[PDB]
Amino acid sequence: PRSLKKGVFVDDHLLEKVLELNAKGEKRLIKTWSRRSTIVPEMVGHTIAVYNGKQHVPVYITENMVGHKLGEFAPTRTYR
Amino acid sequence: RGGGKSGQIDAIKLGIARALVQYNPDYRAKLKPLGFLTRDARVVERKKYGKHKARRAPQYSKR
Amino acid sequence: KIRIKLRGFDHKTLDASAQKIVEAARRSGAQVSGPIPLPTRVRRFTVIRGPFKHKDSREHFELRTHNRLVDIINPNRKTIEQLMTLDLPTGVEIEIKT
Amino acid sequence: ARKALIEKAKRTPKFKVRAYTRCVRCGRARSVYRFFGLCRICLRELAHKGQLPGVRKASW
Amino acid sequence: GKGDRRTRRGKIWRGTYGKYRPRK
Amino acid sequence: GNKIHPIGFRLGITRDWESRWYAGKKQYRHLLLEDQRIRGLLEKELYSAGLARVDIERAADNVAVTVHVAKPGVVIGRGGERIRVLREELAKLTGKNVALNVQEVQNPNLSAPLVAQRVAEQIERRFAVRRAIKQAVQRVMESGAKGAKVIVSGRIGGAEQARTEWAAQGRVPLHTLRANIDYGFALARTTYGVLGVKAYIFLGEV
Amino acid sequence: KLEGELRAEVAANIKRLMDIGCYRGLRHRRGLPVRGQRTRTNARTRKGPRKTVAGKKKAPRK
RNA sequence: GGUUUAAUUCGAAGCAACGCGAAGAACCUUACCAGGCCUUGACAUGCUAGGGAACCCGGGUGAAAGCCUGGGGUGCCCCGCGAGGGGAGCCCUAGCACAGGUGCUGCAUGGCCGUCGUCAGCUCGUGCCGUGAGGUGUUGGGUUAAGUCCCGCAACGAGCGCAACCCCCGCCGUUAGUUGCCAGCGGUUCGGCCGGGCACUCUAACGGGACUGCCCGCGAAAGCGGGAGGAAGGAGGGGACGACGUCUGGUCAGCAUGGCCCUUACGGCCUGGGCGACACACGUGCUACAAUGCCCACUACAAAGCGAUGCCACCCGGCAACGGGGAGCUAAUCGCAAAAAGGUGGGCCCAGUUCGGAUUGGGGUCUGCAACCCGACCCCAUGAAGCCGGAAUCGCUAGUAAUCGCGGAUCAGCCAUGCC
Ligand SMILES: [Mg+2]
Ligand SMILES: [Mg+2]
Ligand SMILES: [Mg+2]
Ligand SMILES: [Mg+2]
Ligand SMILES: [Mg+2]
Ligand SMILES: [Mg+2]
Ligand SMILES: [Mg+2]
Ligand SMILES: [Mg+2]
Ligand SMILES: [Mg+2]
Ligand SMILES: [Mg+2]
Ligand SMILES: [Mg+2]
Ligand SMILES: [Mg+2]
Ligand SMILES: [Mg+2]
Ligand SMILES: [Mg+2]
Ligand SMILES: [Mg+2]
Ligand SMILES: [Mg+2]
Ligand SMILES: [Mg+2]
Ligand SMILES: [Mg+2]
Ligand SMILES: [Mg+2]
Ligand SMILES: [Mg+2]
Ligand SMILES: [Mg+2]
Ligand SMILES: [Mg+2]
Ligand SMILES: [Mg+2]
Ligand SMILES: [Mg+2]
Ligand SMILES: [Mg+2]
Ligand SMILES: [Mg+2]
Ligand SMILES: [Mg+2]
Ligand SMILES: [Mg+2]
Ligand SMILES: [Mg+2]
Ligand SMILES: [Mg+2]
Ligand SMILES: [Mg+2]
Ligand SMILES: [Mg+2]
Ligand SMILES: [Mg+2]
Ligand SMILES: [Zn+2]
């Protein structure tokens, strides 16, 4: 129960960057600050570093997690 | 016109009681002591700030 | 059949200048439909009395717009000529349709 | 508030959803009755000085 | 009552309309 | 806590609005802002004349500013070359063509804004506060008036602990609407803080 | 899809978001309100009964 | 509150802090944290030589800010026939005068607020008393809601308070007829829809109306009890209105403001995070635990409000949120709008239930650049705790409590069950 209508959203500066690295090889690590962006099928492969307000994180990117938003994988707060 | 049916009952009651007196001014004798001529000036009281509801006061602790 | 919706924030100044719009005649030239009451619209603002806390303080302000109608039937041209420079209120406004 | 933080002056706010209010008199960002453009505190001051035409102590 | 979204009472309480409180 | 603005309370009856125009809910906001700018350019530049109040009225685009000063001398200037400069300096902030008028104040000692304004200036010139106030009141009481009252706030005399000084005679009947009590507040920017000067002046009844 | 064939559709549906790096997964694993609630108070229904602990060392009676 | 945290920004403290500042925290707001940057600066008035200077689309890098770079333009005054020299304006670095600071201090302040308390009180002038601080007045006897009035008296008066003057409600009249009608006749596409009139309702300006004025009884008087007439009878009901002071009360984070403090950061801009963290505790609430009830259908009566880059009739698609189309309304005329309890019908039958709607899985809608952190709504499934609550404890004396719905402010949206 979320919200992507007849629009679907992926922040594009990160997208033109990943599709670019789909002309050849996969760049180990991509420095993003946009956790805002949904994951497309074309991201399954290259490990993206989602920020945190504090640290980019090694979010490896399985196909089992496509429809999800990036920030769903870089926990913000620290607990016990 | 206006309000709610139970007040409309009371208001018709005043309406009738008045017509019936301008039809025969003598009727007051067997009509005024019953009270039917008086108009019920009892009306909803305004909502006061810092109250919940005119008089309902918000509940407090520690005293 | 001219239409004149009058309105301002003061009503001492309205009824005393809607009256001055009914200066065609009392009832001897064009009909005159009398200065029409027409309900006022009341905006309210409710302000917490002090700065910083004291929720339960509060103070009410209102700004009320009063509205008149008048309307004159069968507009002779000299009746209109009087709608020129003949006024004194500053806080009264004037819609005109026909 | 911070004189700097009247980048409410920024006519283009980039996105129309970064647009906010601020009291045109004191800067207050938090009770700005949009009719007057004034915050709650300024409104009561101006109301009492009789510089809000038509505005009056209201009781009923 | 007023808490259940899928009822008359409940839809009235929460401003809304829908299957359970038709708009008309 | 206590005590509402004796003006804003009487605003209904015995005292009328400084700016008295009408405007819709898409205009009121703007006219009000510009109306303020005028008071600001006015209260700063006209200090010397000692401006009690500024009436502002509007209509078919035009704006009738009716300034009330004790000494209309200082607003006229070279026989004009000042009331022109200011009706001009208003034409820039107000693109809507202004009309500056000047109103004599017969009796500056019967307008609370000026009386208070008077006291304020002394406190900066380090006058003796207690006397200033007893005096100020007398100057107002000597000029007719049914009653009057003045108040200076805190830090009277550089004194480390803020106080309050008083003085008042005649009747100053605050809770009666049927009054007419001109009120006036003056600020006093001294070397060691700020001080507030409130002035009440009762006169007439109905 | 009813009864059994559903009860383990949902259960295995949760394990999905638990097996990826997902946030809702963490929330499922800790046992804390998945749908973005408050937990400062009032998350009893997700948390189970109250696990009350000692509160002070030098302050009034509360 | 506590604890946690990179940060969980700051304030508020028993009454009188705790649905309080906040009448709208996804970014913004913002004050906090991390990381990328900026410096005469996002804003003000300026002062010396310097290169060029209104300006208009580019490029690289980048999360964005920002940094870097290529390019047509070269105008308006005076001197010169000219190539050119000097210059008003706005753009420009590298320095100075200054900006800026939600950094500190209600333990320097103004302003505004809270509070005792809408309590009936606080004083003053003059006289008199007392060596004096002081007293009398203002104590006493009645009486009032009241230092309200009466009577008394070394006191006679007065001011700030009380009451009255202002507002809203209750009865009536005059002015006023693009809202109102079997009032009265004509027509009906049986809708005040049409002619038509304003009587009535209403709308909203101005007035009348109450005075312990009249009667009976107690009273020295003020007044008390009762009774008529009246819509209303002794303050008819509700507002606004808060004395000298108290709290060294709240607030320098609304705004001022003295002082102290920082000045390639205690200023400034971004992007992301935080303010929403959870083993716990408290306050104020909401929804309940059901039969005087819940569900569905039909049907009846409100008041106050709001509406233009807004309210949206009506039509079509969708289970629906809602999308498409589209009428009217600057609104007493159009719309939000359904009022809801109520009434009539049917169902449920004592059950954790057709009570309760928490939680969770899924599929969607709309707002916004963007809803992971952290939006509201709709639909399907899930259907928790809860059988009326220990010690303790809150509100309310009449259209009150209880209960039922409706509206606004703030606001793209909305965490509103809050507030008015
Ligand atoms: Mg790029
Ligand atoms: Mg009620
Ligand atoms: Mg109060
Ligand atoms: Mg500031
Ligand atoms: Mg906003
Ligand atoms: Mg149910
Ligand atoms: Mg720390
Ligand atoms: Mg502070
Ligand atoms: Mg209280
Ligand atoms: Mg933020
Ligand atoms: Mg030049
Ligand atoms: Mg400075
Ligand atoms: Mg203070
Ligand atoms: Mg009283
Ligand atoms: Mg003695
Ligand atoms: Mg003596
Ligand atoms: Mg005594
Ligand atoms: Mg006595
Ligand atoms: Mg008295
Ligand atoms: Mg009074
Ligand atoms: Mg009448
Ligand atoms: Mg007929
Ligand atoms: Mg008597
Ligand atoms: Mg403090
Ligand atoms: Mg918070
Ligand atoms: Mg607590
Ligand atoms: Mg349909
Ligand atoms: Mg039944
Ligand atoms: Mg019970
Ligand atoms: Mg009582
Ligand atoms: Mg209830
Ligand atoms: Mg809203
Ligand atoms: Mg509501
Ligand atoms: Zn303000």
Swiss-Prot record, chain A:
GO MF terms, alphabetically ordered: rRNA binding; structural constituent of ribosome
UniProt GO cellular component terms: cytoplasm; small ribosomal subunit
Protein's UniProt name: Small ribosomal subunit protein uS19
Family according to the record: Belongs to the universal ribosomal protein uS19 family.
Gene that produces this protein: rpsS
Keywords associated with the record: Ribonucleoprotein, Ribosomal protein, RNA-binding, rRNA-binding
Entries under PROSITE patterns matching the protein: RIBOSOMAL_S19 (PS00323)
Keyword Cell division appears in the UniProt entry: no
PANTHER family linked to this entry: RIBOSOMAL PROTEIN S19P FAMILY MEMBER, SMALL RIBOSOMAL SUBUNIT PROTEIN US19M
Assembly notes: Part of the 30S ribosomal subunit. Forms a loose dimer with protein S13.
General function of this protein: Located at the top of the head of the 30S subunit, extending towards the 50S subunit, which it may contact in the 70S complex. Contacts several RNA helices of the 16S rRNA.
GO biological process: one example: translation
Curated annotation (Swiss-Prot), chain B:
Signal peptide start-end: none
Domain of life: Bacteria
Family classification: Belongs to the universal ribosomal protein uS9 family.
Function description: Part of the top of the head of the 30S subunit. The C-terminal region penetrates the head emerging in the P-site where it contacts tRNA.
Subunit composition and interactions: Part of the 30S ribosomal subunit. Contacts proteins S7 and S10.
Name listed for the protein in its UniProt record: Small ribosomal subunit protein uS9
Source organism per UniProt: Thermus thermophilus (strain ATCC 27634 / DSM 579 / HB8)
Curated annotation (Swiss-Prot), chain D:
Entry GO MF terms: rRNA binding; structural constituent of ribosome; zinc ion binding
Cofactors (names): Zn(2+)
Disulphide connectivity of cysteines: none
Gene Ontology cellular component list: cytoplasm; small ribosomal subunit
PROSITE patterns from the UniProt entry: RIBOSOMAL_S14
InterPro entries named among the record's database cross-references: Ribosomal_uS14, Ribosomal_uS14_bact, Ribosomal_uS14_CS, Ribosomal_uS14_sf
An annotated GO BP: translation
Transmembrane annotation, as ranges: none
Keyword Ribosomal protein: yes
Domain of life: Bacteria
Entry's cofactor comment: Binds 1 zinc ion per subunit.
Role: Required for the assembly of 30S particles and may also be responsible for determining the conformation of the 16S rRNA at the A site. Binds 16S rRNA in center of the 30S subunit head.
Protein name: Small ribosomal subunit protein uS14
Organism field: Thermus thermophilus (strain ATCC 27634 / DSM 579 / HB8)
Protein encoded by which gene: rpsZ
From Swiss-Prot, chain G:
Region described as Disordered: spans on this chain: 31-62
Transmembrane region(s): none
Highest taxon listed in the record's lineage: Bacteria
Function: Located at the top of the head of the 30S subunit, it contacts several helices of the 16S rRNA. In the 70S ribosome structure it contacts the 23S rRNA (bridge B1a) and protein L5 of the 50S subunit (bridge B1b), connecting the top of the two subunits; these bridges are in contact with the A site and P site tRNAs respectively and are implicated in movement during ribosome translocation. Separately contacts the tRNAs in the A and P sites.
Subunit structure: Part of the 30S ribosomal subunit. Forms a loose heterodimer with protein S19. Forms two bridges to the 50S subunit in the 70S ribosome, contacting protein L5 and the 23S rRNA; these bridges are straddled by the 5S rRNA.
Family of the protein in this entry: Belongs to the universal ribosomal protein uS13 family.
The protein, known as: Small ribosomal subunit protein uS13
Taxonomic path: Bacteria, Thermotogati, Deinococcota, Deinococci, Thermales
Shown segment, full-protein numbering: 65 to 126 of 126
